[PDB]
Every structure is written in structure tokens, then in C-alpha cells.
Amino acid sequence: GTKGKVIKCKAAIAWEAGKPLCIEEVEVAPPKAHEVRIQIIATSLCHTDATVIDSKFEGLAFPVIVGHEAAGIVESIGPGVTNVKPGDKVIPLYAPLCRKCKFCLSPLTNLCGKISNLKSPASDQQLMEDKTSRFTCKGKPVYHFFGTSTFSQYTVVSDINLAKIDDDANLERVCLLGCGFSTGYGAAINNAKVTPGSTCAVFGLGGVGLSAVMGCKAAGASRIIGIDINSEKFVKAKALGATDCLNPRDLHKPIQEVIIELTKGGVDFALDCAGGSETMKAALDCTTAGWGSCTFIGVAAGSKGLTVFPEELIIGRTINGTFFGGWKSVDSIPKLVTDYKNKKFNLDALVTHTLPFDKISEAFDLMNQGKSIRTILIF
Amino acid sequence: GTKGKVIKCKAAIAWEAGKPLCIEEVEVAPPKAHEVRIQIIATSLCHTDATVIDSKFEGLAFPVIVGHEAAGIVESIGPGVTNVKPGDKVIPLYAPLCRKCKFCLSPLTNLCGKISNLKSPASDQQLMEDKTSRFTCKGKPVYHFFGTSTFSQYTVVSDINLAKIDDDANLERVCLLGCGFSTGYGAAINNAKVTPGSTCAVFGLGGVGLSAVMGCKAAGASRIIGIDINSEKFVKAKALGATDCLNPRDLHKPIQEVIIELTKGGVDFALDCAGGSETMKAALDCTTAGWGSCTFIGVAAGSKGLTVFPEELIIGRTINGTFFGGWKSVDSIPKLVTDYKNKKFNLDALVTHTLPFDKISEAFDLMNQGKSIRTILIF
Ligand SMILES: NC(=O)c1ccc[n+]([C@@H]2O[C@H](COP(=O)([O-])OP(=O)(O)OC[C@H]3O[C@@H](n4cnc5c(N)ncnc54)[C@H](O)[C@@H]3O)[C@@H](O)[C@H]2O)c1
Ligand SMILES: NC(=O)c1ccc[n+]([C@@H]2O[C@H](COP(=O)([O-])OP(=O)(O)OC[C@H]3O[C@@H](n4cnc5c(N)ncnc54)[C@H](O)[C@@H]3O)[C@@H](O)[C@H]2O)c1
Ligand SMILES: [Zn+2]
Ligand SMILES: [Zn+2]
Ligand SMILES: [Zn+2]
Ligand SMILES: [Zn+2]
């Protein structure tokens, strides 16, 4: 039995910013009060994992185990835990649900007051609630990431940072609900609030963006324009519901102007699922006057964001954003697992590669080289 | 009998940017097809009139007759006019309602496709439909402003740029519905969509801001924080519904942080009724995470706008704006005139000064020195 014992296992550690991850042996401490130790079965790479370890990102403590998109099995539970037991299938959640704070009590948001670093949510939850870490490597502490740290074979999370899911769930596919799918799909349905018959633009056709295409389609959009600088993403996008696909590099005319001409005035809903100043600007610019909606999802390390003028809003734009697709994490994720079982949406289309966890650096290369959508890493 | 005849009258002309207005004798041509010539009875000064003739403002054609906040009486109508007749009391409208375009047909906006300059609406409608002007001075054409040009004793507007109002209306007060009151009041009700029990921050306590205070109160706000760099505005704001008033200059701590501490996390709805980079930043920053709403109203000549990071929206903010308070102009303004007759809101509180039109420069001085809210100018 490993219950109550330190577990020695493999993890991918970022020792410092701007360097590749290193496979190391780590010690994972037993869970304390209101914590759960999880054996990670499958985990995938989100662009956020790469962003936060970039030298241009500020506020992350090193050394760190990143990873936030996974599915696993409960190995053990700490004192006071009643929501899961050993053997349960679970999805670790970076978006907590304490159920008691003013944000958790509101139907208007899926934010939780546990996240106090509002200027940079991705740099919060590097320590457990008692302000210590459950990871050790080479006699020193290793920080958590986003309350999840799924690039370790065993991780420890708070009991409000996981969802118990169906016992028959495919752990090699539902891990995608841990961030990318849920974010894109939910951004369209919950944050953007895409309406039947509307026109949509989705910038960036990766894991999040393809999921936003699926979300727009489920919401009843009549036209869905996919935008990517990689035209190889277009066949998948059209298969998942994109009616049009455009590469900004194909014309000297700025993409927002191409979109405005094509739609005769702009789209109803734009979603930026790529990130950075240029995509933010194009996403806002391509929306119709009167009632145009622009939803920000993507982020870029060292970006200076977007300069906005009041006239751009005065003509009738709304700007908003998403955190984990607007889903109340602990309640919604098990329902999304059931939806997937019932074939409500196509998760398998997101998976382009499957590797052993040892080849985690290849997953980074595939992503940075634009060759993958989601790579599933198997421990 | 002036019908069909050129009218000679007084107007205040801006000959070039950055100079005071000059009272001149101008010739006003008769109205052509689908136009109405109006005798202006009372007109007031909105900050926008000063902004557009500032040297830092780009895209206004000179010489020009500004003014867009007025009430008057119809002197004559051109061919095909079915909506007003000589003698009718009217409010000229810079926000047209053509009723044909995609915007007019939508309940989601009060924009009209007649305004084609969406990057700067204030610089459109300097000419009539046929691309000519009805004003002449010293043998040369003088441009219109915002389709209204109310700083001339007689002006000519299209038949979709005015509202017929109650015969019993007080023209020296309902002129305020021509921009400032309607914008602030409507921004709270229509654009921000202030909800019962909510907390609000209104930045800038002039004509627009005090009207936003009145709007927030009417919408059921339980707390209304007024912000101004001029503390003399606070007695009026509190009288009209402000529960708290703050001057940013009183503490070294940034005003947005003072507001966050005071409300324990920020307000539900912020409205920027001042304008510029500083107020836009403070308005966005002071809003709660989760569901904070920031509405931009104010503009500043030569402003560099606001740099926004996607994280500021990801944590659950919405940003929007107002154009003339979200009112379908021609339909809503007569109803607002009736509301005023029925004492629904306090327009008189907005009037601090009344002057003959000859002293128009004093009205600018009062505004620029911060000594007025609205000055009524009487022809
Ligand atoms: N806000 C949230 O809660 C949340 C959640 C998940 C991911 N994210 C962020 O969402 C973004 C997307 O994540 P992902 O894992 O799908 O990334 P990804 O790398 O899988 O896909 C990004 C796509 O953007 C495209 N792209 C890059 N530059 C572009 C440009 N200038 N114009 C058009 N397309 C461009 C790339 O070619 C790629 O196909 C990332 O910035 C990530 O950090 C945010
Ligand atoms: N968007 C629209 O449809 C619309 C309509 C009407 C007016 N406007 C704009 O709204 C703004 C308000 O117009 P107004 O006529 O009421 O102006 P105003 O000059 O009468 O009032 C502005 C108030 O803002 C205050 N102020 C200035 N800087 C401030 C700061 N940093 N913090 C807090 N308060 C500050 C001033 O002291 C003043 O009391 C102007 O920018 C005007 O052009 C927009
Ligand atoms: Zn992610
Ligand atoms: Zn909570
Ligand atoms: Zn105005
Ligand atoms: Zn119209």
C-alpha cells in the first residue's frame, strides 16, 4: 500500500524559464486535510503550459511541474475528504469550485475566490492551501502549477480542484475536458453566447479554436469563419463545422477587412483562440457595429495586449473573455463527460498524436512547429 | 413669409481648429426634399462641441457650425416631408432613425447606417444628403455638424434627424434631451443595463455623469459612487442619487484601488462619463471580477485610449459603450419629453447657467473652468 507513504515517480520539471522540460524522479508526499493524491493516466499539452515557462512570462516560481489537462484515478484521500474515494476516475481542475464564496454563489461566473492573483491567474495555486508543496526533487521543493501539476505520474490537488467522473470514462480522451475542449466549446456557448442564425469568426484553429467551432455550431451559428496562419488546420475546421476558412498571409488586405467584405459589415461573434496583439485587434475589428461581440481567450507571453479606443465600443461592440469556458468546474465536467459518452461532440478529432510520457519534449516540438492539435501523453 | 426664402440670421462659426467661435451673419437656404428648417429657441453646450474643434481632433471640416443639443420650432418643410409641419415643437437629432437599414431594424442598437464614418461618428453628417450645405458665410459654404448645427438661429436637418415633441414642452429644458441627459440616463439603463441592488461607479459628474447617476438610481442601484476631480460637483450628485463621492486627487492611492477597498472587490457597473486614458483605466480597473461591467461614454481629443490585457477580460469583465444612451432616437425622445412632464427625473438640476446666445464664449469658459453643468443659450 502507498496510502500514507511518500511515492517516488517520474515528472517533467521546468528548472528555469526558457529551457526544455527535464524528466526527473520526484517524491510526492501524501495528501493532507482536504487533499487528494491522483495517479495521472493520460495528460495532454495546452499552449498555456508552454507560455508560463517562457522567459517573457513574469510571476511564475521555479522549479515547477506544469500540466493542467489530464484524467486519472484517485490513489488516496486526506482527512475530511468526502467527494471522492480511492479508485474513482477524476479530472483535475485548475478552476476550483469552493461553493461558498460570492463568485461561486453567482450564476454569472465560474471564477472562485480561491484564485486571488487576478492580474495573472496562471501564476496562482503554486502551493497547496497550507502554503507548502507536495513535491520534492534533489532535496528541494518543486512548485505546483495551476493547482494541478499533471506532468507528474502522481499529483496532489485540493478536494475542490477535481471532479469525480463516470466509472466507464475513457481517460485517454476525457483528459481534453480538463482545459482545451471545455474552454473553446464553453467560450462560444457561455461567454460569447452565440445565437441561432448568427455569423462567427474563430481566430486560431488549435485545440481551443476547433472546440469553439464545435461550440458555435452547437449554438446554431449559420456561418463560421475559421482563421489560421497555418492553412493545414482548415480541413479539420471545415469537418467540425467551419463554413469558411481564411489565412491572413494569403492577401495584403488585413484579415479583418477581408472578413468585413465577405460578411458585408462584420461578424456577430468573434473569438480569439490564438492570442497576442494582432489576433486581439483583428478579432475586435472584424465584428459588426451595432451589436458585435468580441471574446478574448488566447494569451501570449510578453504581449502588450490591445489598445482600445472608446469609439470602437460606442459604435456598439461588446468585449468579454473566458476562463475555462465559463463552466462551474466541479458540477459541469461530469456532465460534459456524459455528453461525450452520448456522442454530443467530437473529441477524437482533436487528437492528432499519442506519445509515451517520456517523449513530452516531442509534444512541445509538435505544438511549436504547428504539426499537432492535441497530443495525448501516456504514463 | 420666410417659406422658400433664404433666411439671414446669427450663428457661431468655428473658422479653424483651436480658436474661439465667432458670431457671424449667415444665410440659411430653404429645405430641399426630405429636409426641415428649424428655428432654434434654446441650445446647450455639450463637451463634444469643444472636443471636435480642438486642434488635436482629426477629421472635422472647417468652417463649421457646431451645436447638437437644442429644441426649437419648425419654420418650414421640404418636398415629401410627412412627419412634421410648420409650428411643431422639435428636438434635432444627431442620431438618425432611417428605419430601413439593418441597424434600425435591430432591437440591439440605436445606430443607423446613415452614419458611415464608424471610426469617428462625430465627423459624419457635415453635409446634407445631396453632398451640399445649407449654410453660407462671406460668400463661402459653411459645414454642418452632426446633422444638427444648433449654434445657428435657423438650421436645416433631414426628416430622419428630428423628433416632433409635445406642444406644451418647455424648450429651455427639453433641449437637454438632445444629447447629455439622454446619453447618461440611457447609458445606465440601456447600455450598462444596471440591475436592482447593484453597485455603480460614475466617473465625471457633468451633464452626462449626473444623468448616469439618475439612470443608475432609476434602475434600482443600491450604491452609486460619483467620481470627479472637481469636488464642487458632489452636492448635486448626492442630491440626484449618489451614495458616495470621491475625488482621485485626495489620496496617493489610485482611485480604482480606493473603490475596490470600499466595495470589497469592486463595483458591478462602472461608467466613464469624463473621457481619456486615465478615466478609462480607472473605470475598467474598479469593476469586480466575475461579472464586472465597464461602459465607455466619454471621449478626449488626441487620447491614446486604453491598453487592455486579455487577463482583464478573462477574469470576467464586459466592456461596452453608448451612442446617445442607446435610444432609438425619433421614437424614444418624445417619450422622454412626456416622462419629464410627469416628473420622472430632474432635468432642472442640470442647468446651472442661462445666457443669451451672444455670450456663447462664456458658456465655453464656464465649462473649461469647471464652473457649470449645463448652460442654456437663448437666441
Ligand atoms: N482563457 C482561458 O481560460 C484559456 C484556456 C485554454 C487555453 N487558453 C489560451 O488559448 C490559446 C489557444 O490554446 P491552444 O492550446 O488551442 O493553442 P494551439 O497552439 O493548439 O493553437 C493555436 C492556434 O493559433 C494559431 N495562430 C497563431 N497565430 C495566429 C494568428 N496570428 N492568426 C491566426 N491564427 C494564429 C496557430 O497556428 C494555432 O493553430 C492559447 O493562447 C492558450 O494559452 C486560454
Ligand atoms: N458617447 C456619446 O454618445 C456621448 C454623448 C454625450 C457626451 N459624450 C462625451 O461624454 C463626456 C462627458 O460630457 P459632458 O458634456 O457631461 O462633459 P462635462 O465637461 O460637462 O463634464 C465632465 C466631468 O468630468 C470630470 N472629469 C474630468 N477629468 C476627470 C477625471 N480624471 N476623473 C473624474 N472626473 C473627471 C470633469 O471635472 C467634469 O465634471 C465628454 O467626453 C463628451 O464628449 C459622449
Ligand atoms: Zn489550458
Ligand atoms: Zn468559490
Ligand atoms: Zn453631446
Ligand atoms: Zn437606419
Coordinates of C-alpha atoms in Angstrom, one line a residue, chain A residues 90-298:
Chain A
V90 CA -11.2 12.0 -11.8
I91 CA -10.3 15.1 -13.8
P92 CA -8.1 17.5 -12.0
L93 CA -9.4 21.1 -12.2
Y94 CA -7.4 24.4 -12.3
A95 CA -10.6 26.3 -11.9
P96 CA -11.8 25.5 -8.3
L97 CA -15.3 25.5 -7.0
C98 CA -15.4 26.1 -3.3
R99 CA -19.2 26.7 -3.5
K100 CA -19.2 29.2 -0.7
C101 CA -17.7 32.4 -2.0
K102 CA -19.6 35.2 -3.7
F103 CA -18.3 34.2 -7.2
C104 CA -19.2 30.5 -6.6
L105 CA -22.7 31.6 -5.4
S106 CA -23.3 33.7 -8.6
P107 CA -24.7 32.2 -11.8
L108 CA -22.8 35.0 -13.7
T109 CA -19.3 33.5 -13.4
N110 CA -17.3 30.3 -12.9
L111 CA -14.5 32.2 -11.1
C112 CA -13.8 31.2 -7.5
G113 CA -12.2 33.5 -4.8
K114 CA -9.6 30.8 -4.1
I115 CA -7.7 32.4 -7.1
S116 CA -6.5 35.7 -5.5
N117 CA -4.0 36.7 -8.3
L118 CA -6.5 38.2 -10.7
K119 CA -3.8 40.0 -12.8
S120 CA -2.4 36.6 -13.6
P121 CA -4.5 33.5 -12.6
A122 CA -2.0 31.1 -14.2
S123 CA 0.6 32.1 -11.6
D124 CA -1.7 31.3 -8.6
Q125 CA -2.0 27.9 -6.9
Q126 CA 1.7 27.0 -7.0
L127 CA 1.4 25.9 -3.4
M128 CA -1.3 23.9 -1.5
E129 CA -3.8 25.7 0.8
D130 CA -1.3 25.3 3.8
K131 CA 1.4 27.2 1.7
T132 CA 3.6 24.2 1.2
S133 CA 4.3 21.9 -1.8
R134 CA 3.8 18.1 -2.1
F135 CA 6.8 17.7 -4.5
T136 CA 10.5 17.2 -3.8
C137 CA 13.4 16.8 -6.2
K138 CA 17.1 16.6 -5.4
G139 CA 16.3 17.5 -1.8
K140 CA 14.5 20.7 -2.7
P141 CA 10.8 21.7 -3.1
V142 CA 9.2 21.8 -6.5
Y143 CA 6.3 24.2 -7.1
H144 CA 2.8 23.2 -8.3
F145 CA 1.2 24.7 -11.4
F146 CA -2.5 25.9 -11.6
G147 CA -3.4 23.7 -8.7
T148 CA -3.0 20.6 -10.9
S149 CA 0.6 19.7 -12.0
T150 CA -0.4 16.9 -14.3
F151 CA 3.1 16.3 -15.8
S152 CA 3.9 14.1 -12.7
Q153 CA 2.6 10.5 -12.6
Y154 CA 1.2 11.3 -9.2
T155 CA 0.0 14.7 -8.2
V156 CA -1.9 16.1 -5.2
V157 CA -4.8 18.5 -5.6
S158 CA -7.3 20.1 -3.2
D159 CA -10.7 18.4 -2.9
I160 CA -12.3 21.5 -4.7
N161 CA -9.8 21.1 -7.6
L162 CA -11.2 17.9 -9.1
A163 CA -14.3 16.3 -10.5
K164 CA -15.4 12.7 -10.0
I165 CA -16.5 11.3 -13.4
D166 CA -18.2 8.2 -14.8
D167 CA -16.5 4.9 -14.0
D168 CA -16.7 3.9 -17.7
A169 CA -14.9 7.1 -18.9
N170 CA -12.1 6.8 -21.5
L171 CA -9.2 8.5 -19.7
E172 CA -7.3 8.9 -22.9
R173 CA -10.0 11.2 -24.3
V174 CA -11.8 12.9 -21.4
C175 CA -8.4 14.5 -20.3
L176 CA -9.2 17.0 -23.1
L177 CA -12.1 18.3 -21.0
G178 CA -9.5 19.4 -18.4
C179 CA -8.9 22.6 -20.4
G180 CA -8.9 22.9 -24.2
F181 CA -12.2 21.5 -25.3
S182 CA -14.2 22.8 -22.4
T183 CA -12.7 26.3 -22.8
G184 CA -13.4 26.6 -26.6
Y185 CA -16.8 24.9 -26.5
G186 CA -17.9 26.8 -23.4
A187 CA -16.5 30.2 -24.7
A188 CA -18.9 30.0 -27.6
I189 CA -21.9 28.8 -25.6
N190 CA -21.4 30.6 -22.2
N191 CA -19.2 33.6 -22.6
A192 CA -19.8 34.8 -26.2
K193 CA -23.4 33.4 -26.0
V194 CA -23.5 32.7 -29.8
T195 CA -27.1 32.8 -31.0
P196 CA -29.0 30.7 -33.7
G197 CA -28.5 32.0 -37.2
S198 CA -25.5 34.2 -36.3
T199 CA -22.1 34.6 -38.1
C200 CA -18.9 33.8 -36.2
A201 CA -15.2 34.2 -36.6
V202 CA -12.8 31.9 -34.8
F203 CA -9.1 33.0 -34.8
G204 CA -6.7 30.2 -34.2
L205 CA -7.7 26.6 -35.1
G206 CA -5.9 24.6 -32.5
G207 CA -7.4 22.6 -29.5
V208 CA -9.3 25.6 -28.2
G209 CA -10.3 27.1 -31.6
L210 CA -11.6 23.8 -33.1
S211 CA -13.6 23.4 -29.9
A212 CA -15.0 26.9 -30.4
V213 CA -16.0 25.9 -33.9
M214 CA -17.9 22.9 -32.4
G215 CA -19.4 25.3 -29.9
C216 CA -20.6 27.9 -32.4
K217 CA -22.1 25.1 -34.5
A218 CA -23.9 23.6 -31.4
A219 CA -25.3 27.1 -30.6
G220 CA -26.9 27.3 -34.1
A221 CA -24.4 29.6 -36.0
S222 CA -25.3 29.7 -39.7
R223 CA -21.8 30.9 -40.7
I224 CA -18.5 30.0 -39.0
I225 CA -15.3 31.5 -40.4
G226 CA -12.0 29.8 -39.3
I227 CA -8.8 31.9 -39.3
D228 CA -5.3 30.5 -39.1
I229 CA -1.8 31.3 -40.3
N230 CA -1.4 27.6 -40.8
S231 CA -3.7 26.6 -43.7
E232 CA -3.2 22.9 -42.7
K233 CA -5.8 23.4 -39.9
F234 CA -8.6 24.1 -42.5
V235 CA -9.7 20.6 -43.3
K236 CA -10.3 19.7 -39.7
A237 CA -12.1 23.1 -39.1
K238 CA -14.5 22.6 -42.0
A239 CA -15.2 19.0 -40.9
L240 CA -16.1 20.2 -37.4
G241 CA -18.4 23.0 -38.7
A242 CA -16.4 25.9 -40.3
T243 CA -18.2 27.2 -43.4
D244 CA -15.3 29.3 -44.5
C245 CA -11.5 29.3 -43.8
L246 CA -9.1 32.1 -44.3
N247 CA -5.3 32.5 -44.0
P248 CA -4.3 36.2 -43.2
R249 CA -1.0 35.7 -45.0
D250 CA -2.8 35.0 -48.4
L251 CA -3.6 38.7 -49.0
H252 CA -2.1 42.0 -48.4
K253 CA -5.5 43.3 -47.3
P254 CA -5.8 42.9 -43.5
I255 CA -7.8 39.8 -42.5
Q256 CA -10.4 41.9 -40.5
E257 CA -11.2 43.8 -43.8
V258 CA -11.4 40.5 -45.8
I259 CA -13.9 39.3 -43.1
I260 CA -15.9 42.6 -43.2
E261 CA -16.2 42.5 -47.0
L262 CA -17.1 38.8 -47.0
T263 CA -19.9 39.3 -44.4
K264 CA -20.9 42.8 -45.6
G265 CA -20.2 44.6 -42.4
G266 CA -18.5 42.1 -40.0
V267 CA -19.4 39.1 -37.9
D268 CA -21.8 38.9 -34.9
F269 CA -19.3 37.0 -32.7
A270 CA -15.5 36.9 -32.9
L271 CA -13.5 34.6 -30.7
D272 CA -9.7 35.0 -30.3
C273 CA -8.4 31.4 -29.6
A274 CA -4.8 32.2 -30.7
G275 CA -3.6 35.2 -28.6
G276 CA -1.5 38.3 -28.9
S277 CA -1.9 41.8 -30.1
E278 CA -2.5 41.1 -33.7
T279 CA -5.2 38.5 -33.2
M280 CA -6.9 40.7 -30.5
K281 CA -7.0 43.6 -32.9
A282 CA -8.3 41.5 -35.9
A283 CA -11.0 39.9 -33.7
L284 CA -12.3 43.2 -32.4
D285 CA -12.1 44.9 -35.9
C286 CA -13.9 42.2 -37.8
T287 CA -17.1 42.4 -35.6
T288 CA -20.1 44.3 -36.8
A289 CA -21.1 47.7 -35.5
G290 CA -24.4 47.8 -33.7
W291 CA -24.1 44.5 -31.7
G292 CA -20.7 43.0 -32.5
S293 CA -19.2 40.7 -29.7
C294 CA -15.5 40.0 -29.3
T295 CA -14.4 37.3 -26.8
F296 CA -10.8 37.0 -25.8
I297 CA -9.4 33.6 -24.9
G298 CA -5.8 33.4 -26.1

